[PDB]
Every structure is written in structure tokens, then in C-alpha cells.
Amino acid sequence: NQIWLKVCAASDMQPGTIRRVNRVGAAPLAVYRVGDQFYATEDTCTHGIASLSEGTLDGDVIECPFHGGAFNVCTGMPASSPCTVPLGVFEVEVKEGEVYVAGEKKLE
Amino acid sequence: LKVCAASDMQPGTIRRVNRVGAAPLAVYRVGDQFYATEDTCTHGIASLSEGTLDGDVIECPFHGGAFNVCTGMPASSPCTVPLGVFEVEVKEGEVYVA
Amino acid sequence: ANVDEAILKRVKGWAPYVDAKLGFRNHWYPVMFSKEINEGEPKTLKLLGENLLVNRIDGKLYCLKDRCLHRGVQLSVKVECKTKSTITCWYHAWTYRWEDGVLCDILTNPTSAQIGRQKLKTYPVQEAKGCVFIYLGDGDPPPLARDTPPNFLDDDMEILGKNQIIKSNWRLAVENGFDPSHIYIHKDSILVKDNDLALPLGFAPGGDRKQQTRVVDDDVVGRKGVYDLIGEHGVPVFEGTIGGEVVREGAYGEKIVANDISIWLPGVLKVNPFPNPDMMQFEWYVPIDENTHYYFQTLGKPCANDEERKKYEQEFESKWKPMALEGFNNDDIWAREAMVDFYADDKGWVNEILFESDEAIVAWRKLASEHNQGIQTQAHVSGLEHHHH
Amino acid sequence: ANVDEAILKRVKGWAPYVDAKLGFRNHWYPVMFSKEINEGEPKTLKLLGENLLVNRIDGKLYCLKDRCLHRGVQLSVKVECKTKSTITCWYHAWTYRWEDGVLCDILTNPTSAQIGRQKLKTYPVQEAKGCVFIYLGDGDPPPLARDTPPNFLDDDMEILGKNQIIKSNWRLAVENGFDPSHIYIHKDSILVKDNDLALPLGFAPGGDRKQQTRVVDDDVVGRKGVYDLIGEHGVPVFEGTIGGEVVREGAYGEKIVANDISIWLPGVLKVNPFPNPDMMQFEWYVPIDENTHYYFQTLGKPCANDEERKKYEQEFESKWKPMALEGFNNDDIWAREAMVDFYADDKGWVNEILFESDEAIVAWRKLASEHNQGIQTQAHVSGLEHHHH
Amino acid sequence: ANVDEAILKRVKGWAPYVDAKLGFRNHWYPVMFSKEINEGEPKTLKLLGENLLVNRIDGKLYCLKDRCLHRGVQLSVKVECKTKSTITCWYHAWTYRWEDGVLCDILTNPTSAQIGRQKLKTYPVQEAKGCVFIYLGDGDPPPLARDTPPNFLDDDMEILGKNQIIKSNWRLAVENGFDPSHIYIHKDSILVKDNDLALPLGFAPGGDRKQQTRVVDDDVVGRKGVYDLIGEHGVPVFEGTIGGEVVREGAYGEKIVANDISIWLPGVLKVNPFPNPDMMQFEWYVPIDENTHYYFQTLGKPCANDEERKKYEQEFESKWKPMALEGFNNDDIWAREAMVDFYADDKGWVNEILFESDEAIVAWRKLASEHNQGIQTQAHVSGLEHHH
């Protein structure tokens, strides 16, 4: 259960909600539902120590609660200042109504 | 004490009331209602009867302080000290005040 | 508008006066004594925020704005008066006439299209009673007498005095001067004891509001000002009490002074008689900038011959200057300076809590609001209004 | 509204704290030592942007605003205390009671309608442990205990200290004090060597967000505070590495100091034990204005009697004040000053890049935002503004 | 936008230049001489409003922004260079590589997730002619040659200089330098008398507007500048007169200097020949902030070998530095300063009244406005802003 992490059921997350996944001995992840699509990034804002799962999802844009920085949850690319460092993006797979997230990020 | 008559002043107007060796009053008509306060602003030496009425709120000409003419409560800074209210009665369409 | 429109909206009584941070435009102001400027020795000063140059050519005073029309440098950084009647900017040698401030030569381009087509701003100057007066204004000046108090210009009146830069807005100086209750600050003046003055601590007013002052809107010479009449129906206070107990007394001397106190636009106080029954005091509070004024003090005495003049100038220098203009008015300087902080953000004009003797200050504020000849604006200072094209 | 609304919109976690540039109203603050104010000798200070006058009358302290109601002058420019219980403004003699600020007399017009109808602002004053506290707020004060750290008020605790004005905003001083990792600036302090302290370079945190601190909002006397618990599940760093090579070591002494670090509203740090294992440090960062604070340093040591207390006063005057309050905390003063430019335009509050030990500061910023008793504004300084509907 | 939109809409032709109170981003600028910065001895400077640190490591210069990513302190408050290749913030020991500015270690928390995941801003630095140039810009720099006047970088060209800080906006310094008529201020200069210089008081412009200057837009190396050609069709004034009366005379002298005057982006003036017929003056006006600039003065002279270099070194030191760089140019310094107040509120740009010789300055303003590589803003200084 390290390559793919069992998160939750696909219909157990309303379009435009965020869910935090605690991995043991590594940084937590954030899984977002934008409409019918699922995406995942590191949970930790790249600008500090804020948890992005306590931010505001506005479509495909997560707003950090600390300084109002933001990221595209699809690309992980910064969407508002002061964020400049891209989030780690984690592949999600919906296999049999079941949400799985990669235990390792795509290579930058 | 006699002041004037119900139709001697209009809705939304003020009227100074001097007194035989006494601190002048200000009489207001708010619709067809009549109220009396001190004429002197509690924030300095202004005459409120020379200010602007805005419903039940007299605005002081000096610094823009304001009072409710019913209650005497400060309604605008810099006023903090409430305005002395006087009892008002009209019998036969002749406005008397206490 | 020099002041937040939210403050001006609140001061309906006298908004133009609260706006008048830099002073009133189109008025005469004294800036120095005749003897302070010699033939062909030009002097720099700042007046209602404007850098000015003054010169004496063939005994007559001329005033240029101290700003080259070209790149906006001060001519005064390096004065080059290269012919009797001109001044040459040190930078590209644009040359102006004192007499009309016409651009008449350019030593760097004698063939320039600018020559004769540009004019440096100038201001009317006029010596009177040994004083240099500048009309900080546009168009043809009015007669000096409009902006001087009664009797200043009387032929017999010998005017002696002194001038310095005080770090307060001119309005705080005016109001302190004309303030009937402010006499409390003078209660320990060397002048009061050593010249045997009667000086109460204040006045308990009587009569009605109108009686506290006489507003002068009716002067044939066009003067505008206010007399303080608190003494006419008022009870002088010679015993100061706190909770029934006497803690201070007034001065019970023989000489009654200051029976006649008047303030005039553009900002000049007359106290008559002062500081002795044979004398009167004329003092100006002249705007230099928002934070600064000239405290231009004079004492007048009628002098019918050249013996009396010599007699006066000797007791001015030995008695009245150091006892009155300094030993009495020095307390007025730090009183003014102490009001700076409260008025500096313009909020004092809203937050001040006035009492009955401030009737005289309110009358001056209305007078000044209704009868000033213009508000000086930062626009005038940076030179974006009423120049030559 | 001390800060651009667009900045406040961005700092959703702690908007009130970022707004609190002038400090929190409705808390007690230490401003001076009891021994610096003598019977009938009024003392001036500024606190939360307000000029204050403190006086001792029959041994008890009272506090008036140093700003006359009339024309906004400081009474302190020329103090006239004419009776025991009153102060008279040097200008127009408005006279106020120390005990309740009531305008009880005016020497210049004993008939004024203002007499008994106007009130100069008062602030409560309390002495504890030789320290003068002022309640910079409105109405009935809470007990001093609410706004002091645990054990400061204990009967056994001998408090010695010093006070000075430091040029930074009070919040920079608070955050520097409670910052677990800032201990790096102290690595070469004379006191670490001369008092054989154990002092790491920093901490590798363990556990989760919640275990890094204990947020106290449930004390019996109402204190609101945060304990720094980075040490409980965290590893002290004694070997500082670059590319895996050791370039600096921490200090290896036997004396364990600073186990127990807490910050309390309105901005007071408790460090226990420090600088010695039988002592505590309590330090306040008191807001004077947006650019300035009092660094009010105290050292607590339980002494049971006259004997102990005199030895402690000797090792305070000879060792602790110079070795610790100066030799250790001098680094804290210039560290605070080094943060001024980044935070000066309020941009720092958006652009800072935090790391893990900043959890303690973040917990402080949220605690202060949620449990402060009000934001001091420029309107509290000059005069509250409100328009009718 | 550093200037009110109301003022920029009125100076339509050269709005970009009026907006550039902080200077132009994405150019090279000289800040000091090579000799002023030693191996492992970091130095501070402010450039285009940014605090920077320069260090020399195995002979090579590196430039980091002097602002810790963490709590925004200057690292130079207490420099801690703990390895040859890094600098460690004094506050919480965030440690950066000089080479690329990567946050490579944190002594106070070696387990931090920020490690390897943040980068302090770096700028390219190059030494040429014993001068230190910093590329205050983003991405790969252009060749240094683009931002130097022609001949400065020539192999035989021996460059000696003087640098100092002056309290005027850089643009007032540029305009003064290139103002053909400003030479009036130099009329009593001791260099004139002593090196026996010919110096007019001024110029009667001849020819048409376009012949007053040559706007250079076609240099192979990308240079963008203006030659002042007022000397070609115009008449040099040697007798200044007020109503036909001679009041002042020019400098009658044998030595002909300053035939060839050119201003170049980003703000360097070339005067050939000066202050002697076999030498040229290259002088930059480098923006430090709104109110301040480096007056970076150099004198160039071709020298074949060490016997001639040593010769030039000697009379720079004993003649040209004291007599020209100081004795001539000091009047430019106070002239610059005399313009601050009129231009302070950005209103001088509207309110000046130009005359014929100002065509040179008008050509620089238009050239600066269309060929500059970027406007430095307060956003670059404190941190770029943007909301979605």
C-alpha cells in the first residue's frame, strides 16, 4: 500500500471539496474533487508550513489560508503570489469507484 | 411657554427659542412631531438651531457632531455628552414647551 | 483643497479657513525691514510656500519667483546678476528682468525662439513704515491700507519692531494672539511687574453672543477684521479658585493696557494701548509654509518731531524690545508651538472643545472664511496656476 | 483598519494581529519602575500612541491623558499642580481632578458651562513587584493577573529588571522572543560560557502540528498564552552541518535553562529557568507607537527573606543585568531591528517564508487574534470617529 | 507604473522613461572596481532599489540578493561564510549556495522540508576593465558590449575610474551629462584654464531638428544611444551678451575637446576626446533608488605596453582624477541636486519649458522609452504581486 494509497470512495467527496491523506514517515497529501475529476498535490504550501487542505478551493485553484497564495491543483503551478514554487503533483486513479493516490510525486 | 403654531414651521425645519435670561432652546419638527433640546452643542459653543436636520438628527454647524432630537443621544462624533431634552405639547395648534 | 474633504465637510462654519493651511493668496504681507536689503544685494525668502527673490535697484525693491522657467532650479543656488537690471540663471544662462520678469536674453543660445516669449512670475513690493510688504497675489494690487490695521500708516506713527521664523502654522499664531482667555499664560511676565500692568487671569462673559465682538465689514479702505469686546459686558477675574480656595491672583497694577484688541485679514493683530498707554502693538503672523510663520512684531508711537523719534528708539532698544516683544510675547511663541501636534493631522479642527471666550476666535474664523481673497494651494507652490504661457 | 484591507484579506489566519500595529487596547502594560516616580512629581510617557501623565498623590499612582480637552496641548509643557488632587492647564487654566479627570474648575472663566460637563480620559495604574502597570483601556480593569505570566505575582518572587526604548514594532520583539530557532543568535553569548549553559543551535521537531505548542485559553484567572513544546518530541541540534560536514557546534554545559517558554497576551514572555536554574525571566514588549516599544526586562528569583534578596541584588547588579539582560538579550535587540524593513510596509506579513519551528509563532498569532481585548487605532489616539446612519 | 497615470498620459511620447524612477531592469550596470572586492570578503550595495551581496570565490564574482527568504533580514547584518561556497543567515542559519542561491542547508533544523526547495535570487556579475558589472535582470544576460559605449571594451583601452554616491534620481544626472548648453556651469572650471581648453558658453543651433542628433539603432552588438550633433550645423557662442552688451566670454584655448558626445542605454555618457585630446570619458549614472545614483566615472586611453600604462596610471592619479573627474565634474554634481525639487513630485516632466538645445535630451528620452529592456517597479523590490 505504498505505490498506490487507498484514500476514499469517489462519491464520498462533493464536487469542490478537499481531503487530506496522512502518509506515515512522509509529508501529507491533498486530494481535491474539481467537478467529476480528482487531483492530488503535496498538502504543505510551498511558501511555508500552511495545510492547503484548510484553504479555499475555487474550481481548479486552491487558496492557501496563511498568505492568500494559490496553486492550480491540476498542474501544481503557482496561481497567486506570494507562491512561486510548484507543488508536487501525485497521480490519482479511480479504480472501481475507489480513489487511489500515488505515494510518490511525478518528476519535476 | 409659547413658541409658535403647528403650521408656523414645516416638516424638516429648526427654530431658535430664546428665554428671559436663560440658555436658548432649539425646537424641531420631524414630520408632524415637535421636540425641544438645548440650542448649545455639548461639544463646544455652537448653536444647533443653525445646523442641518436629517430626519430626527440635528448636525452641529461647527465640527459636524450630531444628536437625536427625541433622545438627545450623540449620533455623530465628536459629540459624546447627551443633549438636554425639554417636554413639548401643542394645544389648539399652539406649540408650548417646558 | 489642502485638507481631507471629510474634515472640510464637517467644518461648515469656516471650511475655507481650515483649507488655508498655506495662507490667503492676493493679500499684502511683510517679510523683512527696509534696512535688511541693500542696493544690488538680492535676498531669498519663502512666502505662502513660494521661493522668492527680492532686489533693491536704484533704491526700488523688485520681487522675482526664485525658480528658472526652463528646468525649475532656484536662481539663488548661484546668483549671477550680470547687468544692473537683470539676473542670469547659473545653469543655461536664461536672463530675466527684475522689472517685469521678461526673459530677454539667453547667453547659451542668443538666437532662441524663447527670448521675449517667456515671463518669470513677479510680485508687487512696497516699503512702508520701514517694512518690506510683498503682495503674494495676481493682477493689480489693492492699496496697502486694506491689509494693514487702522493707524499703522498714520504719518506721525513711528513703527519699530522685529521679525523671526516660528515653527507653528500661522493660524495657531493668529488664534493665540486674538484669544481673550490666553492672558493666563502672561500672569508672570517681567513686563506685568516692572511696568505695573493691571492683568486679570480672564473674563467671565456677560451679554449675548453678538456683543462679544464687533465684526468690521464696513471699513471705507476695505479692511476686514474683528474687535474683541469681552471686556464690555464681562467680569474680569483676579482670583483663581479651585474648590472654593484661592490658588492664584491676577496683577493689580495701575496701568490699564489692551482696551482695544482687533485681528485683521490677512493675519495681523492690533493691541492698543500696548505695552504702555502712549503706544500700540501691530503684529503679523506671515505664512512661510504649512509648519512655519514670520512673527513680525511692531510697536507704534505718534512722534510729531525728530527729538521724540530719538526718545522712542532709545526706550524701544533699552526697555520695550527686551521687556515686551521678548519678555511678554516669548510665552506666546511656545504656547503656539504646543498646539502644533493636535492640529498637525487637521483633526484638532474637529476635536477641539471650545468655551465661551472662543466666541472671538469663531468670529475671526467666519470673517476670514468669508472675506479672504483666495486660498494658496500646493498648485500655486509648484507653479501650475496664473503664470505667463 | 491600521493596515491595507488587501493585506488583511490575505492573512486569513491572523488578520487582527497584523492590524494590531499600535497594540491591543484593554490590557495592562508595565511602563516604569515604582522608584522612578516620586510624590507630587508627575512623569510623562507614551503608551499605545497616547501621551500620558502619571502622578503619585498620598503615595498612590494616578494617570491622566497628557492632552487638554480645549486646544489639545500637553499639560506637561508647563505642569501647574495648584492643589494636591488637581492639575491646571498652563494655557487657559482648565483644571482636572487626578482621581476622575472631571473638569472641576476653569481659573480664566469660573462661570463656563463646560465646568462639570467635560472629562479628561483617565487610565487605572497598579504597582506590583516594584513595577508600574497602566490599563490602557476603557472602564473597569480586569485583575493584573490576567495580563501577567504565571508566577510573576507569587509572594516569594523578588523581581529586578531594566527598561529601555527599542526602535521596532512590538510584534517583531514578541516573535523574536518566542521563536524556538532564534537561539542560534545566542551561540557565542558571553553568558553561555561564563555560566556553563547547555544551548543547542536549534531543534529537529517531532510529532504533529498540535504537539509543537500548548495553547492556554482555560487558565483560572483568564490568562491567554502559548507554551513552546518543540523540545518534547524534538531532537536538539548540537552539530550544525553544511553538505554533511560539521561547521558549528552548540554549547555543552551541565546547566539546563529555558525548558519552559510561554508567550502571554498582551505580549509578555516567560522563560524558565533562565539565566540560572533557580530563576525565571519575564519580559514585556510594550507598544509606544508603530515604530517603538519598551523592552521591559525582569528577572525573578524566589528569596524567602532580607538576607537572600540582598545577595540576589548584588549578583543582579554585578552578574545578571550585565551578563544576561545585556550580554545575552542585546542580540535580541538587533535581531528585532533587522526585521523592521521587511515588515515596515506590512508586506512581510504576506511574503515571509516560514519553516517548522514557526508553528510556535503561528500559534501565538492565532491566539493573539482571537483573545485580544481590542485593536488600538489612530482614531483612539486623535479622537474616535462615527457618522449617523 | 511608478508615476500617476494622469502624468504618464500627458508625456505620451516618453511615458516609459518618466515611469522609470528606479531605472531599467535587464541591463548591466557597473557598481564598483574589481580591486574593491577581495577573495572571501563579501560587500553590500543597493542597485535599482535591491540590496545585494557580492563575493569573490576562487577569483570569480557571485551576487546574491541581501535578503533572507525566511524573515526578510539582510544577511550582511552579520556575514557568516561557514564554507567557501555558501552563506548562512545569522538569524536561523538558512544557508545558501553563492553559485545558484539554492537553500542547501538549515543548521537550526537539518530535517526541514524547505531545504532544497527554495532559491535566493542571484544576478550575473562580470569584471571588464577592472570594473564590476551586475546584470540586474532575469534570464540569460546579453553580452556586456550591448550596455557599454563603443571603444570601452577595446583590448588596448586602459580604464581608470572613480565611483561615489550622489543624491539625485539617475535621470537628472543623465540629462545634465548630455545637455549641450549645460557647459555654461563649467565656464570657471580650473581644468579649462590649466589644460588650456577651448570651451564655448553655448551653441546657436543650425540645420533642422533631425540633424541635431544621430539616434543609433543599428549597432551590430545591440547598443542603443544618441550622438549630440549640435556642433556640426550650429555656431559655438564665445561672447554672451545682455542687450548686445558683452557680460561674459567663453574659454579661448588651443586644446579641442568633446567633439563626440553620446548617451547610451542604460545610462552611460561617452565624451571623445576628454579631458585631453588623446583620451575619452565614459561615465554611468547607476540607479541606487528613487533619490540616489552611483556617479561611476572612468577615463579611457589607448596604451600599447606596460611603459605607457604606468605613464597613464601616473597622470590619472596626479592630474586627471583631481583636475577633471573632480575639478570639472563637481559642478555637474550640484547642478543635478538643484533639479531634485522640481522633478520630485514627477511634475517637472510636465512643467519644464525646454528650448532648442534640449532636442538632444528629447532624443534620449524617446530612445530610452522605446529600446529599454524593462521598467524596475517597487514590485521587483519587495516581491512580485498577482492574484487569480
Ligand code: FES
Ligand atoms: S504559507 Fe501558503 S501562501 Fe504563505
Ligand code: FES
Ligand atoms: S461644537 Fe458642536 S460638534 Fe463641536
Ligand code: FES
Ligand atoms: S534651468 Fe535656468 S537656464 Fe536652464
Ligand code: FES
Ligand atoms: S488648551 Fe488647556 S485650557 Fe486651553
Ligand code: FES
Ligand atoms: S531570517 Fe534568515 S534564517 Fe531566519
Ligand SMILES: [Fe+2]
Ligand atoms: Fe499673548
Ligand SMILES: [Fe+2]
Ligand atoms: Fe533571544
Ligand SMILES: [Fe+2]
Ligand atoms: Fe558637465
